Amino acid sequence: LPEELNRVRLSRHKLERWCHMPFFAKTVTGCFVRIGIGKPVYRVAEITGVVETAKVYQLGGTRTNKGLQLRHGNDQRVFRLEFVSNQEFTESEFMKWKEAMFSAGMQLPTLDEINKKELSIKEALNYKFNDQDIEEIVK
Amino acid sequence: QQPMIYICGECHTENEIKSRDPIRCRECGYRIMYKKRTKRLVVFDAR
């Protein structure tokens, strides 16, 4: 279903609160994003990890140069956090993503996996900044 | 759902500060920061 898949969709507004938070390769790795490829067609890709690009760009108020190593079945390339859209996974896009996953041979993640992974972002949002992370963030 | 929005000292940048947290700004890092105007019905009589 597309409705259950949109629970872990990392919108463009949520990513602005974890631009310098540690453990970025643990909570983010597993969710899906509607990266804009482009004319209005979109392609859902899996978050394999985290990369850093050499180009610095501004995203509204804040600004980050980090990349996002995504992959849609087999085609993989470097992307940016500015091209991500806030729209939800449509039925056509969901069917295209399912077909790409079936063709690539990657097993579809189980429903329990998404159910237990959606809580990671919720628990990280309310995380008390008691340790020594503010200094790294400001630096 | 009010995260107690505060304003930095010199940078004048909005910061979300909760209880049991150090009072430091999201960048640079200072120790002085003020609050925002209330949302109440501030109504004066021009007398």
């Binding site: 919108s11 463009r12 507004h13 949520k14 804009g36 490829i37 091209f83 859209s85 729209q87 | 759902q1």
Partner: peptide, 17 residues
């Protein structure tokens, strides 16, 4: 205050660049 999108702020595409 999770995501005040209200759509968005004109999201850029990859190939336009």
């Amino acid at each position: 205050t999770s995501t005040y999108g209200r759509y968005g702020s004109q999201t850029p595409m990859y190939g336009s660049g």
